[model samples]
Target: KLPVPWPTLVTTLVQCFSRYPDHMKRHDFFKSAMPEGYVQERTISFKDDGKYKTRAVVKFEGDTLVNRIELKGTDFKEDGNILGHKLEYNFNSHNVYITADKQKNGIKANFTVRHNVEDGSVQLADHYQQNTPIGDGPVLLPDNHYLSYQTVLSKDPNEKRDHMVLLEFVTAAGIASQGEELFTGVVPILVELDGDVNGHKFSVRGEGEGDATIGKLTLKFIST
Candidate 1:
């Protein structure tokens, strides 16, 4: 799926309509819904695609999705639905379904986002570190496009291994006029769960920082 954020994208589309309603009205755009519930036709280009220009006219809207469209030449289309308490997004063509469902021990806290990419899958047939609650999200990075959260899960008794998960969110910024606008999508959540002991699975935790390579194997983490 194309890498982009939903929250920011939706907010931008709505803001563009509010900020330049007159422009939209002057054009009398297509059936694309704008702010104030008007399906005025308008062409908007947020990304600079150079010669291969990319733009979108308002597509559809309601209390649900505010905008939906496919890029000029891309095989995938993007859409975001705001279902009050839930959110549904189509990245490129993959599905990123999020809801305010609470799991046991409040795992994942107030929301749960599942990324179903490709046809690959996994099954939890062995005893391992289960999904634990995420009490708080990560701190917003300086770029305003990424968030990082880290936590240590339970350890293995027999192997004397410790596990941890590093969650990161990739996003983009919206118009500065909206102050602090809400954004989602985050393309795909990057979750790194690693388990190692003394010097077996991984080298000793070095101070400051260290570099190490991990083999591609059965490891639970979020991916596209």
Candidate 2:
């Protein structure tokens, strides 16, 4: 479709997503779409089907760190949504570094994850929170590890329109949640970002997998 990297990019995106299996791992993926905004946040958990399907929403928001972000109620999908949708965030990281916070229950605790984009991957650095102890508790980890990612492209064969770029990749990937959906005339595509956590953006690379649902992306789409 596109010249240099667009075809490879689209195909790569397709393959990356097509390879998704309700449950995916770091070495098992490449890239996907990304939500953008500053001082903004989100949470992605898995459903009971051994799939990355997530549920149980409880979060609140305010001035995070840098830009004051708010999740909208319109942010819900079979995959995920923005926090303004459900309080929008778990912990607080409106500034400096990503911070993970936690809450207590009868025994287990809720997760307040803080994340940051390292050189070329995401570091699941900080796990629990302060003042609370227990080598156990809900933990949010960042890297010091490799990364990977997922990318998506709009399939419009007409006027080169409606294309979307997402930051769903990590230098190294470690977790994945997935599910299947059947839409007659709709393209239900779900994507994930792996270890590839270091940039201000994402890419739909060349070498990877593809599916009718998912595809790998490449540089061919750059409208030079």
Candidate 3:
């Protein structure tokens, strides 16, 4: 198994683009992965089994879309050693860029993914030492590496009891691999909602004690 949760990581990364402005969101492959309508900003807090904590925020600023994720706890590790990390993804009409930072054994590692929205081309790079910046890292994937993404949303007919939102997607296998570690797999993100049919209010279920508020986008940008 891969040391990192590639499915969750990748799915979340790709889904973040859906929160962009209408113009940008129209170009996203998984635009329908999110609920219908438009949102200026959205946030998802994932605390798996009360051990791992992660918070993802996506918002639009001018012509750019900013997606940031912060992971804390002993969930992500390198060679059995846990390391916290942060990921930042920026998207615009031209391209998409992602950067990740993590430190292990006194050595900081920076990983990046660059994609051209118009061409569907992707590039991956990484650096091991703290002195080497992400821009200086060598490309891990070839210049011709291409990325294809898709999402499927289905309703649960049997249990229409409580309103909920479910999102499922999978990254193509062998999309990117490092040395002997190969990142591959599929994961589903389930988000339960509680409110009106307008989807103006919602919260995440199974987050342990108190549910994490999955903010609904209102006309005035006020979260109830």
Candidate 4:
């Protein structure tokens, strides 16, 4: 018995084989084994009960695994991939092992996923990327006014692993400001070194909630 959702995981592969058996023939995953290269590239999309369950469009180039997954209402996108007699697929810094179990009615699978190392330990910290410092570094924001920042999310090797960014909002009066936990994820993927436009947008924090001295904030995160 695997700790993760075996049904969904196994069903996903089963559908893959049924749909693209020919394409996957040369691929090691079709043989329920891994390639000597210890590396492979694949992309698949599946819908459950006539509804879309999940889909991933991924590309593994060198140490970077560019991936995106759709799960129900939430869409998880990240840069991340394998071995064995069973099926193997490595994603991010993790390894997935799968074996098919024949059943009277259908096929069941047993699986295990972990760090692809001897000790087999995983760290979100290692998957961290740099931060996209929004607003002016030493710039003052207007008090009681709404400001929205825009940018897309990404995972980079040279960035910090902190899942979320910590920021402070300024007030108008006696410097009464509040701390706001905004933008939870790695640093933004910028186009140019000094470019700040064209990213995802985030509405102003602590704008209507309170009023104090205004234009006061402190942002900090762990650096590698």
Candidate 5:
């Protein structure tokens, strides 16, 4: 699973954007499943102690969400504690459980990431508007990917939002390689009609991008 705070934090934040707050279902993330669409960009912000806020755009084509991003923020203590804004551009297509926890003692950090990916569907849109700092990912993989910061899921939403998705960038020997790799604890599947589905819910289930037969964007990451 993700390290600690990562899984705990990310999952919790994602749940906050749920469309059906009463039932806690119908997340805006589902809309990003669609290809060839421009989501408005949602953002979450909060600097007060014991509270937070989030905002982002959700775009969907049919029943699939191809692209979704969270402009999320957090507030915690300083010096080993966390309290600030954490923005992320999250895209999904892989089924995996995600978590981020600090195996050591005490530590915390926060930041915002801008994400841009081309989910080509029936058409194309220039939704990604910004210059670049330049980074590289999957050079040997098949299709070339423009590297940048990845979206962070900071906490678990099911329970008071404490757990988070985690990804560590070290080895057993404590050697640094390419960077941090993410492991999830919550498997994402299609949105489930859980009766109280105003409390509708979903989890990562399978792999494979919906717009192509060759190389496609299933799921990946960026760090901030």
Candidate 6:
């Protein structure tokens, strides 16, 4: 068995972006996409069985908004699963692209988010696969996962609208045997956005609990 749950780790990492009401807000594209440029650094702490910390930086590189997050901590290094890995996200008006890399294993996965201007619908895709050599031949491993989100707009009496986002996580791994077989399914996560967003700094916190697939994911983000 693997040292850590790959699905849980990946899902928790992506959850950081789902805190935005309109999805694009997570990248601060709405407010900080200025010509002068913008940069924000955030530190996230994951509190579960072990304490883990991640450092994230979001900046505007010309027209594309780039967000990079590094997962770190002594606990993670000791575990030796995915220590010192990085996840990079690039966001523009039409698409959001993601790439994750391990310290020595090169790129592990790639994902993309496309917004349909015609239908106002969103599409998420994951292009990841791992193959291992068995006695007979090479077999595909169940280590891939996907993420999806839905947004609801509420109109107030004053004709103003409020945005709420819901995130759904799915993985292709067996839960009963812990990655022994392939089991594709979805774990719906209702994420609530709370904290402060202002000119000087941006802060948000999210928690995911009571799910067997992903035990508990608690994250705190603050960027300035």
Error of 6 at 76 (Å): 34
Residue pairs with backbone overlap in model 6: none
Q: What is the C-alpha lDDT profile of model 2 across 79-117, one tens digit per residue? A: 221111221111222111212233421112123222222
TM-score of each: 0.17, 0.20, 0.23, 0.18, 0.23, 0.26
Better of 4 and 5 by TM-score: 5
lDDT of 5 by residue, 21-70 (tens): 21211211221222222223222222222222222332233544323333
Error of 4 at 48 (Å): 19
Q: Candidate 3, residue 104: CA error in Å? A: 16
Query: What lDDT does candidate 3 reach at residue 120?
Result: 48
> Which one wins by TM-score: 3 or 4?
3
lDDT of 6 at 24: 27
TM-score winner between 2 and 3, please give it: 3
Q: Please, what are the lDDT tens digits per residue for candidate 1 over residues 1-224? A: 11332221221121111211221222111111122222212222222210111222221223222322222222112331111112223222111111211333211111122322223321111110111122232211111111111212222345433322221122112212111121111111111212121121211121111011110111122212
RMSD of each: 22.0, 17.7, 19.4, 25.0, 19.7, 19.2
Q: What does candidate 6 score on TM?
A: 0.26
The segments of candidate 4 whose C-alpha lies over 4 angstroms from its true place after superposition are: 1-52, 61-63, 73-97, 100-224
TM-score between candidate 3 and the true structure:
0.23
Shift of residue 107 alpha carbon in model 6, Å: 6.4
For all candidates in order, the CA lDDT equals: 0.19, 0.23, 0.24, 0.20, 0.22, 0.26
Model 3 lDDT per residue over 124-164, tens place: 32211121112222222211111223332233466433322
Q: Quick one: best lDDT, which candidate?
A: 6
Give per-residue CA lDDT, model 4, range 79-172, as digits (tens): 1111111212223322222222222211122222232322353312111111111222221121121111111122335744422122223211
For candidate 1, give the lDDT: 0.19
Tell me how far the alpha carbon of residue 120 in candidate 6 is from the true structure, in angstroms, after superposition.
Answer: 5.7
Q: What's model 5's lDDT at 75?
A: 37
